[PDB]
Paper text:
To identify features differentiating the ligand-binding pockets of human and fungal [name] BDs, we determined crystal structures for CaBdf1 BD1 and [name]. These structures exhibit the canonical BD fold (comprising helices Z,A,B and C, with the ZA and BC loops defining the ligand-binding pocket) and closely resemble those of their human [name] counterparts (mean pairwise root-mean-square deviations (RMSDs) ≤1.5 Å; Supplementary Table 3). The ligand-binding loops are structurally well conserved, including nearly all water molecules implicated in ligand recognition, although the overall binding surfaces are less negatively charged in CaBdf1. Superimposing the CaBdf1 BD structures onto that of JQ1-bound Brd4 BD1 reveals no major steric clashes between JQ1 and the fungal BDs. However, whereas JQ1 fits snugly into the Brd4-binding pocket, the fit with the CaBdf1-binding pockets is poor. Replacement of Brd4 residue Leu94 by a Val or Ile residue further contributes to the poor fit. In addition, the p-chlorophenyl group of JQ1 occupies a groove in Brd4, which is absent (BD1) or shallower ([name]) in CaBdf1 (asterisks in Fig. 4c). More generally, recognition of the four BETi compounds by human [name] BDs involves 16 residues, including the eight signature residues previously used to classify human BD-binding sites. Five of these residues in BD1 and four in [name] are invariant across human [name] proteins but diverge in CaBdf1 (magenta arrows in Fig. 5), including the WPF-shelf Trp residue and the Leu residue opposite this shelf, at signature positions 1 and 3, respectively. Remarkably, nearly all of these residues have shorter side chains in CaBdf1 than in the human [name] proteins, implying that selective CaBdf1 inhibition could conceivably be achieved via small molecules that clash sterically with the human, but not fungal, side chains. Nevertheless, an inhibitor that targets both CaBdf1 BDs without inhibiting human [name] BDs is in principle achievable, because the WPF-shelf Trp residue at signature position 3 in human [name] BDs is bulkier than the corresponding (Val and Phe) residues in both CaBdf1 BD1 and [name].
Numbering used by the authors: 383 to 490
The structure:
Amino acid sequence: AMGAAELRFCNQTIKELMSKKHYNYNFPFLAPVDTVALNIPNYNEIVKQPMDLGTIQSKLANNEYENADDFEKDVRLVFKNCYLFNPEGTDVNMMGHRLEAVFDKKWA
């Protein structure tokens, strides 16, 4: 697993993305996609791997990431999956870009 200092930073980062400070645009990403509610039955077979912020937090807590780059890859996957299913200009697409910008600022 990643070193202690990077683990702390990644924990802070995922908590930031999930924070109530961003409640108006992180809600689509906190938990697994509701494929029934969204009428996207083949979602899991289309995306490379499904992912959500809560699962990233749980994977981090179980020491699943070898380094912080691997943590970043899962964050990017959340947003890649967003844009694959939500066209540019739509509400959820824009929320994804806004939350990804929060990540980019923290990660820079």
